[PDB]
Amino acid sequence: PQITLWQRPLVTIKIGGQLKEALLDTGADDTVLEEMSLPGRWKPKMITGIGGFIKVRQYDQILIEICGHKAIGTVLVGPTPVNIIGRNMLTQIGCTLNF
Amino acid sequence: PQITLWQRPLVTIKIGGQLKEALLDTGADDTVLEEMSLPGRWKPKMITGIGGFIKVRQYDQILIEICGHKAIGTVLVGPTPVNIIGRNMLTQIGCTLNF
Numbered sequence: 778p779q780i781t782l783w784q785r786p787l788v789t790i791k792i793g794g795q796l797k798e799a800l801l802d803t804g805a806d807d808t809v810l811e812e813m814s815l816p817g818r819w820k821p822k823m824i825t826g827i828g829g830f831i832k833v834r835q836y837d838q839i840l841i842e843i844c845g846h847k848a849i850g851t852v853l854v855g856p857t858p859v860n861i862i863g864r865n866m867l868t869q870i871g872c873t874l875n876f
Numbered sequence: 877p878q879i880t881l882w883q884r885p886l887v888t889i890k891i892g893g894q895l896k897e898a899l900l901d902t903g904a905d906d907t908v909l910e911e912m913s914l915p916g917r918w919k920p921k922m923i924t925g926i927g928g929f930i931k932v933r934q935y936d937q938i939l940i941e942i943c944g945h946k947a948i949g950t951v952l953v954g955p956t957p958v959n960i961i962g963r964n965m966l967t968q969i970g971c972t973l974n975f
């Protein structure tokens with residue numbers, strides 16, 4: 778698709794067969810998710826945003842479908858108000874910024 | 877241009893006649909820049925992202941060039957770790973997400 782930005786670029790994602798929605802976020806290095814059921818073990822990790830550091834749970838090799846495109850990588854579960862799809866995933870689905 | 881996301885989408889901006897660089901940030905509602913001099917009156921504001929709040933000064937109808945493209949809007953000045961260009965400005969230059 779070609780997505781304008783007059784509203785937040787939220788899209789449908791699928792993880793563990795669960796349908797969610799998430800923000801396509803070119804400003805985010807990592808992918809950070811709301812609480813949800815994920816397989817495997819996690820490890821504690823800390824990342825920062827504009828307001829400072831948070832503790833998150835790091836899951837590796839997670840499969841996700843983003844607006845129909847498959848991606849696999851590291852996802853961080855933590856105190857985020859919204860699922861955020863960061864560049865580690867965005868690149869896998871061929872996403873670009875255009876103007 | 878077309879900007880891939882293998883690295884941070886940083887671009888040149890010009891504001892207050894000064895050249896800086898900033899992050900093209902589709903996940904950000906607002907545009908937030910490091911401490912700097914701007915004209916007019918400001919209003920105090922608090923914004924959030926991941927990790928909590930920061931206090932900023934809000935300036936309205938500020939002129940900025942983004943990669944040579946003119947935009948006018950609200951700029952928030954404060955202790956952000958990185959200059960970020962949010963959707964309020966990105967929309968003025970016709971920026972889209974494409975995959």
Ligand SMILES: CC(C)(C)NC(=O)[C@@H]1C[C@@H]2CCCC[C@@H]2CN1C[C@@H](O)[C@H](Cc1ccccc1)NC(=O)[C@H](CC(N)=O)NC(=O)c1ccc2ccccc2n1
Pocket residue numbers: 800802803804805806807808809824825826827828857858859861863901902903904905906907908923924925926956957958960962
């Ligand atoms: C996700 C993580 C890996 C933590 N990366 C980010 O946090 C990086 C960090 C880099 C340096 C510090 C400054 C931000 C740049 C950008 N951000 C991504 C960046 O895209 C971040 C993503 C976002 C969506 C909303 C909720 C939180 C997170 N957006 C932002 O921080 C901007 C700040 C701003 N006023 O515009 N926040 C939002 O526009 C914002 C939106 C609505 C809100 C609702 C509830 C909660 C918090 C609220 N957040």
